Amino acid sequence: MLGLKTSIIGRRVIYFQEITSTNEFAKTSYLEEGTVIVADKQTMGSPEGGLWLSIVLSPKVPQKDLPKIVFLGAVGVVETLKEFSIDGRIKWPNDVLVNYKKIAGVLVEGDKIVLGIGLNVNNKVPNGATSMKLELGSEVPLLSVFRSLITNLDRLYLNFLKNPMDILNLVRDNMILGVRVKILGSFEGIAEDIDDFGRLIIRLDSGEVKKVIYGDVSLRFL
């Protein structure tokens, strides 16, 4: 009844009034590539009003490219936000902020790779965070956001399978750079850009250049 016209992402959609975690369900269950798991709320990941979903992916691309899947989610969210005239910017490598307030988070877990996305739409949010409703000053049709995001993600994914390096330029043009950050042992410096592997390039005050790979660290803006 949804009439989705995507190639892979959204071939099937499993909707839940409530679920513990869309990522856990997607990881555990036997699902086909492109299947989207979406729930009104998550009890053990996410209140009603937000967009909580996970996508099952099985990209046949060199192992060296797999680490960029998180970027597909971040860029997809930024593109959807722009469609709704909201200025979302990427906090390397998995979050999207609006005026430095978190509006969305991406979590990839993995053969079968699960791309999880949580976006604040009409739900109440934690202090310091924001939502589409708070930014636009009015409720936003959740289904419209879902349709927009799925369409963007499908296009981004299909191109990623053919041109795995393309996503990097989209990330660069939509990410927060040129400001000081703290990488948590722990160091500070200017976030200059991301390299050809998606690593965050940081210039320390000493002049030293460090390359950050995600997985074992956290980024804090100063």
Added chain:
Amino acid sequence: MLGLKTSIIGRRVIYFQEITSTNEFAKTSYLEEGTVIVADKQTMGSPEGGLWLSIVLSPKVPQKDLPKIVFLGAVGVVETLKEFSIDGRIKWPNDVLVNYKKIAGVLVEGKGDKIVLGIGLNVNNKVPNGATSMKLELGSEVPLLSVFRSLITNLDRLYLNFLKNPMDILNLVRDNMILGVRVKILGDGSFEGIAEDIDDFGRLIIRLDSGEVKKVIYGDVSLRFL
């Protein structure tokens, strides 16, 4: 993201861009009660534009009541059509007509302790000559999701009451079905007469011209209006 507020039917929904058969998938897959399987189109037992779905049910009601599930679907469709200003009438036991043109069909199948309620409703899809659709009746494109939401809401309500008061559905069928007209039951031992009413088992009561009264069981029956 659909924000369904139903109790059982619609707790989970599995949507397919394309599927062979929603009934087949629902029958062969382990799914919690209330799961709705819906597809834009079915390729093998339903073009784009229609509402094609199946609902998984495992009602803990007496064996004698299990056969009435088909009526839940038929009445649910009639109620949804009414909300859209369309007057549908039930052609016993599983079809819904509008001005005698078929607009929906219900098919109930099963596997183990699970019953699958299948419903096919013509909304914006092209239909065979003689049949109709919500689009043809209203003269405009009808938002498919709104029809889905309406139908799921009605079915959930009918189902929750059926679990408690299983005889109630028969009254709703009776008040929404085509009666007082001549019909012919096809097949072996074929016969014709007036469709008088439905009894406490959901059987069609037919009065033959001779005065003989026959009771027709549903599920696998072929009936024609004369």
